[model samples]
Target: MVNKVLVANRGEIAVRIIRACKELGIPTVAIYNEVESTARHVKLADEAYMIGTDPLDTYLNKQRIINLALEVGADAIHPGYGFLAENAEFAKMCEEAGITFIGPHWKVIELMGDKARSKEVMKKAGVPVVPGSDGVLKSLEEAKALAREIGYPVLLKATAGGGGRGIRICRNEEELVKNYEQASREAEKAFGRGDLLLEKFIENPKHIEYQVLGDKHGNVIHLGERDCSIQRRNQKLVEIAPSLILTPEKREYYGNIVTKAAKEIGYYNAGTMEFIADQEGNLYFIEMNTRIQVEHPVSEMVTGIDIVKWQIKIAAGEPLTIKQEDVKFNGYAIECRINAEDPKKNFAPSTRVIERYYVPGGFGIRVEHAAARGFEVTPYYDSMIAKLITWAPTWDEAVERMRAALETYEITGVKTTIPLLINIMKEKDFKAGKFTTKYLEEHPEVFEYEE
Candidate 1:
């Protein structure tokens, strides 16, 4: 077991990691910036330290966090999701310093972090990747040629890009030519590189991702898939476990592929294998998230597996006790990312002190948040203030639970997406699980509501 864990991030995820550590009988150290002195995570940890005042220099400063961890005698560091969670160099730093990084090996992180290279590796491993160019497109001719070969409606993606940036969907030759340069420029601006890859775009594909856990001894098992197709500009809004779109055979088939890929890469700890399923039910390997995801609670609810604890135990060189047969999906679970943003204003972030706070609570409702009555919704970090998860034995009941929970949830002083989420739970298509990546775009009426 890890002697102590240093949570190297803030917000709800940090709080989440600390709670897991407490359950595992591990003391936790939390790091926060000066502005976040009274943050929920800070209050939850056994010990809390201020990294720095500068926002970027705080959680993102790799060496500073490591030094603090060393000083506090924390043998392991749990980077909960962002800010060096998937950073290969930071993991290497921890490795060289004899501090356990509670995730996959640094080498695996490096390989999976690169979109272009990971695709090639997956291809070699016999995973079904979207048909596209071999690597970064050399010129407009190459992009156009690949589009012609793969057919129009190809996606131009940045090799190093994330957060929905540096991507363009080109429908034809004219759009391809126009978007190539524009996307490249955006990629350069966002990721400091213009390297781009072209791939066949499966329009209206369902965004399904499988959660896999591995041990140092090469044992890997998948916790099934999450349907995260409900999106606004490539950001997932609602995530459901045991996706309705996949049949039992299809789920098992994809789960086997995911576990196989993880074993081939020598992956350990928690990771997500993201895929996009076409309307015909063909699944294409897209990319892997090298850390715990924002929507992990949905998977946890359905599988009854503690992914964060497994990450720590795996980092401590423990083999997984659970086998594939032992893993069982119990019921339906849905997670709605409650952000401090206004949907009417195009989901613009809202920052203010939470004057009043009340969360939904019931047998099937679970809320994960770092916010409180007096907590300030700052602009320094992600606008997501809470994750509202609801579980039920059946899909329809789960939807009803989420709908009821959203109605009861309240937060004052900062505009939230609760209104829009409430509408989505009541939306006919969402209730029927008939949404794709283009759900929000196709149903703009969901955004309309009285303020």
Candidate 2:
């Protein structure tokens, strides 16, 4: 068994991973840039090491980081989301250095990281995929032709696109031509792949994803589903567990198929299978996020499974001890991301020192954060300051708890999205989980923006 892990990221995620390691009796080492040496995450780890001068160098410096891990006698490295978490090269580097990379192998990463290849693999695995491009589009002409084959209003995307970039919707031949060019250019700049893939776009769709955990020995289980329907563009803003739209039969159907497919691939560690479902109840596999996600707390609250803990264990050559039947959902859970950007000001990130730090809590309310009374909101990082999660015996309870929690939480240093969150939670559609991806876009009053 591995005795120690080197955390390859920063902020709340690093803190969260270290806490999980402590519970498993595993020591944790955190690497940080010079500026983050005094941050909360560094203070939370058993030991902290300086990796480099720049933030990117600090986290993406795999050679130095692996050397540090070996030096500290750490047996594994956990790339906690973002940075190099999904980078296949980093994973292979760790494997070469005799350090456990707490995720899938680089081969699988490369295999599935390519969307076109993943789609083909999923089809072969008997997993249902949305119909559209047969493979990567050979040219914009090919994309237009595929759109016509799959029906109009196709989603043009880069195989390497993620976090919602390089995605566009084309309703017809003209739109397809223009959008394909834009998508290809964006994909080339961002993902180094000018190649684009096309998929049938679902109108008024619900963004749902299954959290699938697998082992090297083919043991795989799904924690549950996260209904991330509420979004701006393709980015999810709010995530709720046990999707309000799922019937018991539908849950089992989607959950079983996804888990089975993951096992067939010998998938190990935490991964997410994202899907888009139409109103008529057809779901399609959009992509798989082969890393721990931001909304993971929703599954954690209901399943009583520490996914991060299991991710570490599985990577260390431990076969998964849990089975699908052994997993059960207890209650409803919801997580709201608290970002430091001012929603009223075009989401301009605020970097002022917090004058006051107030987080909501009670019987069922839980908040995950690395911020303290005087923690400075740095402009150098993501605008998300913390994640506020709530759990209850029922879904309604979770909703109510989040509302009350949002009310009590306050930050004075700079403008935050707290008010927007409170307003969102209070809306009838939001409370009832009746909203879709257009929930925010349809309601201009949320930001009071005008066309």
Candidate 3:
């Protein structure tokens, strides 16, 4: 019984969580910095409070957030995503304060946040993981030996890395030796840890992930998988439900494995198990995200499941009423991240004030955002300002809908990725679902479109 929820984030995700709470008849509290005083989420929440002006002292301030939640009589806190969503210490503090965290337990967050440790746990749970070093490499000799055993073209990844940082791919011994020191320095600078692990890099693999939901009553079920192979420098740009490559049998097989792994790890709440599929269709577990993903709408559109609502209910000790057999996928759904970036300028963030704004609308089209006319795109947050999703009974129809939607979406005074997204919708490989993680790299022409 979450009577009141304090949304501990800002921007579109904050608005998203507040809406979910409102539909459930729960009072919502929003916290904002001086820069975000007039933000959409602040206006939408039942109560809004000012934190500090600095984002670090505001949204990322766990102690301040918990105190605010306590002051507002909020029984739970919803960390939408980013900021402190996956911070174990923040979750633990909420637990200690007798407030529900609206996510997995603190221990689960701690375990899954460590990529190397989570891989070991997944392997122990009978899930197939990517071939790599048994753990962090002890020495260059150890790394070289493991690389030889796993074969060439290996990836050196920071154990604490996320969001495409702290990674280096080495094709040969010379490259491996050359990149070791630089990779360590980058890891330490990015995540405060230099520990690195080795993995056999699967060439041009497809990025697939399964969404799983669990409850306190030991019930766990998977919604299905989303293909997020469309990426730029490891950052996902476009995502689709029911991956074009996975057959019905393969989807079921992977979904069952994900559910079983969740149960084995005693996981509860919403989580994602990511896997990489090579050309031959073999899947290997890469890592798991302990929080809700940015592309959750695609799954929601295809499965008719309200993931945020379930997060709240499950946090309140509600048992999952939807069984595995009851979960059914319908139609095709696609989501394009509408980033406030200038594609012609190498995708740099565009922080100008918006003078005009308009979103597409029609059957099977959904746009989620906090942007509007007179809104200023701040440089303090992620480049993405909105998410555009389209769904249809068939893949072809969905692509067509996305194309039309992208064309109609208008935002001025700041460059956007809409033009590039429109080009992606018109791409032949994308239309036919023939692409890998290297799609963006291989097709540089997608960035050459006229504005």
- Alpha-carbon local distance difference test for all models: 0.88, 0.83, 0.88
Give the poorly placed runs of model 2, Cα more than 4 Å off.
133-199, 448-451
Clashes of each: 0, 0, 0
Model 2 lDDT per residue over 340-412, tens place: 7777766678877777887776887877888877777666678678899999888777888888898899888
What is the TM-score of each predicted model, taking all chains together?
Answer: 0.88, 0.86, 0.88
Clashes of 3: 0
Candidate 2 local lDDT, residue 133 = 72
Worst 10 residues of 1 by lDDT: 158-167
Candidate 1 structure quality by residue, lDDT tens digits, 140-202: 998887799878688887666642355688999999888887776676667566668888989
TM-score attained by model 1 = 0.88
Cα RMSD, each candidate: 5.5, 5.9, 5.5
Model 1 / residue 194 / CA error / Å: 16
Write the residue-wise lDDT of candidate 3 on 1-451 in tens digits: 5899999998889988988988999999999888878999999999999997586578888888898898879989999888899999999999999999999989999999999789889988888888987767787788888889888899987666432355689999888877777776666566566567888889989999999999989999999999999988688899999788788888898889899989998999999999999887878998998988889999999999999899999999999999999888899999999998987777889988888889899999998899888788777878777899999999999999999999888888888899899888888898887999999888887888766
